[PDB]
Amino acid sequence: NEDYARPEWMIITVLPVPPPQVRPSIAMDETTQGQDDLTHKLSDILKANINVQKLEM
Amino acid sequence: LMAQVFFGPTYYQRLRHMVDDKIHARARGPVQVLTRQPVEGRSRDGGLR
RNA sequence: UGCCUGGUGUCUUGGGUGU
Fold first, then answer.
1. Of A19, A26, A32, B48, whose CA is between 20 and 30 Å from A1?
2. What's the CA gap between A24 and A36, in Å, rounded?
3. Which ranges of A1-57 does DSSP label H, i.e. alpha helix?
4. Does the beta carbon of B19 lie under 8 angstroms from any beta carbon of chain A?
5. Are A4 and A19 in contact (CB under 8 A)?
6. Which whole-number Å values give the CA distances from B35 to A14, A21, A40, B19, B32, in the listed order?
7. Distance from CA of B35 to the nearest CA of A (A)
8. Nucleotides of C under 7 A from a protein CB
Protein backbone atom coordinates (compact mmCIF):
# COMPACT_ATOMS: atom_id res chain seq x y z
CA ASN A 1 0.00 0.00 0.00
CA GLU A 2 1.43 3.36 -1.04
CA ASP A 3 0.00 5.21 1.96
CA TYR A 4 0.53 2.70 4.75
CA ALA A 5 2.93 -0.14 3.85
CA ARG A 6 5.67 1.00 1.50
CA PRO A 7 8.19 -1.74 0.61
CA GLU A 8 11.34 0.20 1.55
CA TRP A 9 10.02 0.67 5.09
CA MET A 10 10.86 -3.00 5.72
CA ILE A 11 14.50 -1.91 6.16
CA ILE A 12 15.22 -0.20 9.48
CA THR A 13 17.05 3.12 9.20
CA VAL A 14 15.77 4.75 12.41
CA LEU A 15 14.79 2.75 15.48
CA PRO A 16 11.97 3.78 17.84
CA VAL A 17 12.96 3.65 21.52
CA PRO A 18 10.01 2.60 23.71
CA PRO A 19 9.28 4.55 26.90
CA PRO A 20 10.27 3.15 30.31
CA GLN A 21 6.66 2.04 30.82
CA VAL A 22 7.35 -0.73 28.32
CA ARG A 23 10.63 -1.76 30.00
CA PRO A 24 10.24 -1.00 33.71
CA SER A 25 13.10 -1.50 36.13
CA ILE A 26 12.80 -3.76 39.18
CA ALA A 27 14.36 -3.28 42.61
CA MET A 28 16.04 -6.62 43.27
CA ASP A 29 16.87 -5.65 46.86
CA GLU A 30 16.60 -2.60 49.10
CA THR A 31 19.56 -0.88 47.40
CA THR A 32 20.29 -2.25 43.90
CA GLN A 33 17.67 -2.06 41.16
CA GLY A 34 17.78 -4.16 38.01
CA GLN A 35 17.71 -2.89 34.45
CA ASP A 36 15.24 -4.63 32.18
CA ASP A 37 16.29 -6.93 29.35
CA LEU A 38 15.07 -4.47 26.72
CA THR A 39 17.10 -1.69 28.33
CA HIS A 40 20.29 -3.77 28.14
CA LYS A 41 19.57 -4.75 24.54
CA LEU A 42 19.00 -1.12 23.58
CA SER A 43 22.27 -0.19 25.30
CA ASP A 44 24.06 -2.86 23.26
CA ILE A 45 22.44 -1.61 20.04
CA LEU A 46 23.43 1.98 20.81
CA LYS A 47 27.01 0.95 21.63
CA ALA A 48 27.22 -0.86 18.30
CA ASN A 49 25.86 2.23 16.53
CA ILE A 50 28.48 4.41 18.22
CA ASN A 51 31.18 1.91 17.27
CA VAL A 52 30.12 1.93 13.61
CA GLN A 53 30.04 5.73 13.51
CA LYS A 54 33.48 5.99 15.13
CA LEU A 55 35.02 3.37 12.84
CA GLU A 56 33.58 4.90 9.67
CA MET A 57 35.06 8.38 10.10
CA LEU B 1 -33.94 -45.71 63.67
CA MET B 2 -35.69 -48.12 61.33
CA ALA B 3 -32.35 -49.09 59.76
CA GLN B 4 -29.47 -50.45 61.80
CA VAL B 5 -26.16 -48.63 61.50
CA PHE B 6 -22.72 -49.97 60.69
CA PHE B 7 -20.65 -48.84 63.63
CA GLY B 8 -17.07 -49.17 64.80
CA PRO B 9 -13.65 -47.55 65.13
CA THR B 10 -11.54 -46.69 62.10
CA TYR B 11 -8.16 -45.00 61.74
CA TYR B 12 -8.50 -41.51 60.26
CA GLN B 13 -5.80 -38.98 59.48
CA ARG B 14 -5.95 -35.20 59.22
CA LEU B 15 -4.59 -33.77 55.99
CA ARG B 16 -2.66 -30.53 55.61
CA HIS B 17 -5.35 -28.81 53.52
CA MET B 18 -7.43 -26.61 55.82
CA VAL B 19 -10.00 -24.08 54.67
CA ASP B 20 -8.47 -21.20 56.64
CA ASP B 21 -5.30 -21.61 54.55
CA LYS B 22 -7.30 -21.41 51.31
CA ILE B 23 -10.01 -18.77 51.85
CA HIS B 24 -9.20 -15.57 49.97
CA ALA B 25 -11.06 -12.46 48.86
CA ARG B 26 -10.04 -9.25 47.15
CA ALA B 27 -11.79 -5.95 46.46
CA ARG B 28 -8.81 -3.81 45.45
CA GLY B 29 -5.10 -3.94 46.13
CA PRO B 30 -1.62 -4.12 44.66
CA VAL B 31 -1.17 -4.38 40.90
CA GLN B 32 1.75 -5.35 38.70
CA VAL B 33 4.01 -2.55 37.53
CA LEU B 34 4.23 -3.69 33.90
CA THR B 35 0.57 -4.48 33.20
CA ARG B 36 -1.29 -2.74 36.06
CA GLN B 37 -3.38 -5.86 36.67
CA PRO B 38 -3.92 -7.53 40.06
CA VAL B 39 -0.91 -9.45 41.34
CA GLU B 40 -0.86 -13.25 41.59
CA GLY B 41 -1.12 -15.09 44.88
CA ARG B 42 -3.23 -15.35 48.01
CA SER B 43 -0.24 -14.37 50.15
CA ARG B 44 0.22 -11.16 48.14
CA ASP B 45 -3.48 -10.18 48.20
CA GLY B 46 -3.70 -11.07 44.53
CA GLY B 47 -6.64 -11.44 42.21
CA LEU B 48 -8.33 -14.37 40.54
CA ARG B 49 -7.87 -15.19 36.87
C1' U C 1 -1.52 20.88 73.88
C1' G C 2 2.10 17.30 72.13
C1' C C 3 0.15 14.84 68.23
C1' C C 4 -0.23 9.51 63.62
C1' U C 5 2.31 5.90 58.39
C1' G C 6 0.03 2.65 53.82
C1' G C 7 4.41 1.14 50.12
C1' U C 8 6.18 -3.83 47.93
C1' G C 9 10.94 -7.56 43.39
C1' U C 10 11.65 -10.38 39.36
C1' C C 11 13.05 -14.56 36.94
C1' U C 12 13.64 -19.71 37.12
C1' U C 13 12.74 -24.36 39.44
C1' G C 14 10.54 -27.97 42.46
C1' G C 15 6.78 -30.20 45.12
C1' G C 16 1.68 -30.33 45.67
C1' U C 17 -4.57 -29.45 45.12
C1' G C 18 -8.99 -30.10 42.19
C1' U C 19 -10.91 -31.77 38.05
1. A19
2. 6
3. 37-56
4. no
5. no
6. 27, 9, 20, 31, 6
7. 9
8. 6-10, 17
